[PDB]
């Protein structure tokens, strides 16, 4: 997604 960063 471009609106939110990846979660870890």
């Amino acid at each position: 997604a471009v609106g939110i960063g990846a979660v870890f």
């Epitope: 997604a1 471009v2 609106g3 939110i4 960063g5 990846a6 979660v7 870890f8």
Partner: antibody
Framework: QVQLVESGGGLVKPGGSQRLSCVVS????????IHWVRQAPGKGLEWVSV????????YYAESVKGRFTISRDIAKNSFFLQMNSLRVEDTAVYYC?????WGQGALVTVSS | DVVMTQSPLSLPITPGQPASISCRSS???????????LSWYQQKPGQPPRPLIY???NRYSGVPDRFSGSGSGTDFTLKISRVEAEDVGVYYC?????????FGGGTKVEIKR
């Protein structure tokens, strides 16, 4: 095109369970985490849960920890929110979303 | 959690006139990947949020160029250069840099006629 098709909304007694499903088409699921975000009637947006592209990392809003569980069946491009021990304050329209694209929403009403 | 403060809560406006909505975050919004994840959404009654702006200033496809986003650090602004009657609805900012993702409280844009 991208569509997130939701189902499973409805009326539940307090303490009951609902399962929401979200079928994703047209979205590359290897590069977008899948989230659930809810909106109580007349209120704003509140993030509920996330599952990572890797299918292992999950996180939850404090208000639903221990009660909600997010999961997926990647083979069917499907994502699920299992909502247990529901409370009246959980009443809301629930959206599955990757933040770029949003499902149509599913209303969950918790009432006696 | 990142607190997102939106201002004003209500914005009545005549079509053809400009509008400006402020969003202030309690922390910086730079993700590990280097991007700044501040988004703006438009929501009409009975519809899901429509994403208008991603990463501070980038319009999602098909969004009219009368919408523009700016800002940095903790201070951000959505501007509508000239409002149209179809812009009526509730606008939200949101951050996607820190878990949990959080949203502003909304600004209700009302059209004067």
């Amino acid at each position: 095109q991208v569509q997130l098709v939701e189902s499973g909304g409805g009326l539940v007694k307090p303490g009951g369970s609902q399962r929401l499903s979200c079928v994703v088409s047209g979205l590359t699921l290897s590069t977008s985490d899948i989230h659930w975000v809810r909106q109580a009637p007349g209120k704003g947006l509140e993030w509920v849960s996330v599952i990572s592209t890797n299918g292992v990392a999950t996180y939850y809003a404090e208000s639903v920890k221990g009660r909600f569980t997010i999961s997926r069946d990647i083979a069917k491009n499907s994502f699920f929110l299992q909502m247990n021990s529901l409370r009246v304050e959980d009443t809301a329209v629930y959206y599955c979303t990757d933040f770029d694209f949003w499902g149509q929403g599913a209303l969950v009403t918790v009432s006696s | 959690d990142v607190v997102m403060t939106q201002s004003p809560l209500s914005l009545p406006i005549t079509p053809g006139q400009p509008a400006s909505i402020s969003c202030r975050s309690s922390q910086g919004l730079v993700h590990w990947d280097g991007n700044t994840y501040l988004s703006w959404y438009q929501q009409k009654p009975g519809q899901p949020p429509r994403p208008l702006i991603y990463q501070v200033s980038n319009r999602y496809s098909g969004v009219p160029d009368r919408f523009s986003g700016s800002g940095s650090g903790t201070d951000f602004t959505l501007k509508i250069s000239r409002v149209e009657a179809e812009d009526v609805g509730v606008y939200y900012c949101g951050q996607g840099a820190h878990v949990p993702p959080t949203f502003g409280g909304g600004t209700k844009v009302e059209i004067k006629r």
